[PDB]
Ligand SMILES: COc1cccc(-c2cccc(NC(=O)CCc3cccc4c3[B-](O)(O)OC4)c2)c1
């Protein structure tokens with residue numbers, strides 16, 4: 001393979017890409033890149049559906065003292081949740097980078113995550129902070145002969161798509177990205193610099209997102225239906241990111257419906273005209289009807305789980321899941337509509353509240369991913385960050401898009417965890 005940036009050719013160099021997490025799955029993103037003696041780790045998250053050391057990527061398969069560079073795409077815990085453990089409980093001595101906004105949220109986010117088999121303590125989190133260097137967007141940095149810079153990814157504030165260049169070979173890692181313009185977030189940039197390799201998320205496979213006006217209308221109608229019948233509405237959200245979006249939509253809908261002005265909306269985490277802030281359960285009068293937006297987004301524990309257990313037995317109540325549901329979480333389990341749930345204390349409760357799923361996770365759909373790949377046409381595309389069935393359908397659909405393309409033949413890979421993808425560059 002001739003690098004796209006580049007006579008009797010000499011020796012070929014082999015590039016190695018191996019996912020330790022997010023390989024044919026969603027969670028614990030951690031992809032290893034090896035080329036010409038350099039070793040790079042892309043993200044270092046935890047699996048939200050597993051517990052303890054099982055929620056970590058397969059770090060045992062590598063020698064962490066040989067990792068030259070660690071790049072963190074955004075502040076979500078499936079991409080940086082394992083970072084304090086990797087920085088403090090392991091022989092890693094390389095350099096770590098994330099954007100300025102990402103580091104700022106990371107310190108408070110993981111501090112919250114620790115408070116609510118503990119991989120690390122809040123002590124470990126604070127000592128590893130100075131090991132994390134920052135980087136501006138559209139600015140080249142070099143570490144051990146590795147040139148890298150980042151583009152805007154959309155998705156959440158500070159989310160970055162890292163471009164990596166070693167010996168003229170360019171690789172683009174999208175992390176999590178979205179191409180649909182938000183109310184408070186830009187769409188992901190499409191680089192004009194063309195990469196040899198693309199590592200791209202596959203969260204929604206070949207699904208196509210419902211138009212934003214349709215999902216917003218159904219979201220507001222479902223909330224309205226819940227409080228109108230005297231119910232309490234639970235909107236589990238991950239602390240920062242999509243929560244501000246949903247609060248804008250509800251604040252606008254409340255203003256245009258005066259019959260809802262007396263119904264409170266609470267946002268509980270650690271300028272609207274109809275939304276109040278909430279500190280904890282102690283500061284909250286559970287008076288129905290009401291709307292409560294609480295963390296975490298998948299009711300694994302914490303406030304959203306406590307409110308769900310308090311409200312799930314009343315059919316007037318309802319929960320609205322707005323994010324992507326990972327296997328092993330309570331939010332994914334209730335999609336099957338079980339007769340009963342199990343509380344954190346081990347008690348069985350009948351699930352009688354309504355359960356609705358209106359997606360607002362801010363990932364690309366097939367159209368956005370296909371357009372993104374067509375604009376770049378990288379000879380090799382590697383799918384990560386997606387369930388096995390969704391990723392297999394995305395691979396087949398993208399392959400079919402380029403069988404009749406005489407200009408470029410694009411190879412698509414969907415490696416399992418620990419599975420290596422090998423590419424040779426002249
Ligand atoms: C009490 O706090 C807790 C307790 C236990 C587990 C978690 C936890 C762990 C991992 C991820 C998460 N959620 C997130 O990062 C939110 C974003 C998210 C959520 C689900 C799936 C995906 C993403 B994505 O946009 O990064 O793409 C895939 C929470 C938190």
Ligand SMILES: [Cl-]
Pocket residue numbers: 036167
């Ligand atoms: Cl070199």
Ligand SMILES: [Cl-]
Pocket residue numbers: 420
């Ligand atoms: Cl191998």
Ligand SMILES: [Fe+3]
Pocket residue numbers: 074076155176
């Ligand atoms: Fe994310």
Ligand SMILES: [Fe+3]
Pocket residue numbers: 076078079176385
């Ligand atoms: Fe993710």
